[PDB]
Amino acid sequence: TTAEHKQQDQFYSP
Amino acid sequence: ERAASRKQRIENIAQELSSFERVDLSCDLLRKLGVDMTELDTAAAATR
Amino acid sequence: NAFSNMLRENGLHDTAREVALCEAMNRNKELA
Amino acid sequence: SNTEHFLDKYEPKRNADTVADKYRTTKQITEIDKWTRYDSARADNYRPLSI
Amino acid sequence: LSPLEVQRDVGRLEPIPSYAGKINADRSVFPFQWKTEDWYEYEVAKVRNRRFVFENTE
Amino acid sequence: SANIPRSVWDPAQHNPNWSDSYGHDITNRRAWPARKWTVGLEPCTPREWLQFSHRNLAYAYNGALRACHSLPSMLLLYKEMKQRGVKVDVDTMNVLLTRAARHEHIQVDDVFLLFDELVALGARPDLAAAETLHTVLSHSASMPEEWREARRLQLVELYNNLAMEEVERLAPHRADRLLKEQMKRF
Amino acid sequence: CDEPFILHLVKRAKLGECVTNFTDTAYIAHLESSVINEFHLALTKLVGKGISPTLLAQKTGQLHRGSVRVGGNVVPFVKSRELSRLLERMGLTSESIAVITRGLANCPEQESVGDDFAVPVSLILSWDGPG
Amino acid sequence: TRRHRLDEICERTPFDEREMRVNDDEMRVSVETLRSWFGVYMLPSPTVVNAVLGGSASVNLHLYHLADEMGTADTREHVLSSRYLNRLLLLESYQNRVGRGFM
16 A cells, blocks of 8 residues: 555544 | 776776865775775875 | 765765676676 | 756657646736835835925 | 654655764753752742843943 | 934935835735645645645645656656655655656666665655566666676665565564565565 | 748747747747747857867867957857757757758858767857758 | 965865856856857866966967866866956957957
């Protein structure tokens, strides 16, 4: 997956 | 024939690093690995 | 790799590239 | 371009560049501001001798 | 690695800040920790002295 | 002295740095165009500044890059994002190097030059990138031998740095199976 | 076809045919002049690129003769290969570039150097092109 | 005397291109381009200056570069100097070039 996804989307959120 | 471009590349890098601009940077870079020649330091410490 | 590494850090990329090229060049006919 | 970059080779030819942007964006200095009524009436940045 | 030298961007490699492992630790310097008596005295002094100023000085 | 000072009325004492009244205030209310570049808007209001970053601009430009299907159209965007300082990514590197290695007429030389330059700007090479470089090093038999060996040396260096970095990443998590796989690939 | 040849072709290439999308006369005029100054400057960056200073010294010495008036001027020679290469970057056709090379080698002001021919920049600005 | 010393010190100092800035609309141009267009005598290399100040002859106004002790073309821009330009003001050719031909 895109390094961007794993920088911003890899945290718990609603 | 393929050892002629070895010669040519080495000479080009040599005359590129000895250009008036870069002589200083080349000398400092020269001290920092394998090369100690007092042939410079003595001539300079004579003038200091 | 002792040379090109120094030159890249001191700001000179092209000369570093050519020199690395020259070191690999040496190593080729040294090993073979 | 001052020094020609090594990527310049692959820079697309200007065929069908009719959109060309530098020419679309360039303005006459005349167009950049308007003279408004605020300017007609503008006070002075120095102190006047007599008005 | 000290927490400042760790590379935390998954997509970049950044130059390590020049203060990273360098600044040393003296409780005399920081963090600020202090006696209460001295703090009181300091605060009060600083209020009482607002007007002791020699303006005109050589 | 005098009630009205010489400085006011005497041209000998004229101040050349003073400017007329109208000019500065006309110059001041100027709002220059916010779309100075492709891909973005320059912040104008403090609110707009809170939405802004170079490191995020990276994201937007990466998208705009994945959009272009041809290397030539990509090169332009890249030149922009290089020039306006934009933090550049693993991803900028992946989408560039892939579409440079597929592009038919590329001198392999420049693919590697480009990689080098992306890394000089501080993009962190990763497995995808190194592997693509590797694939480009296979498809070139047409270069001088010393070139091929120079670039092979650099590539091995790269794969090893990667393997180390990745062991350090995976070890504290007690990942053993996964780590072992990644090593299998390296 | 009223103008100097190469300038005409460079305007055709850089301004395209879309220069007349614009209905403003003065604007188009400025576009032209700025394109030409860009060209002129690039052309200058190319003076004496592939030629040795000895060759140049020789030919300039011959072209000045015994005149003191011209002694301080320098004849700005450009190698033809470099000219063609520039006109390629700028997006001229090779059909026309070849016309330009072929027609400049027929000019009196041409000087043959290092088994290639070069010309004065003044010529590249003033030349008509049929002959 | 003062001007003289200043002259010697100017000739041995490298020109600093960082300081150079471009006023509106002007083109950025390297020393090399300027030299090859206007002639080297105009923005002389130290070898050229040294030659002009040490020599005599008129027929030489130096248009192209000069050889150096290392056998290369000396490309150096040191700071310009009062006395060098005076020595040029002596040649007829140069007088004509700068529009003083009437002299």
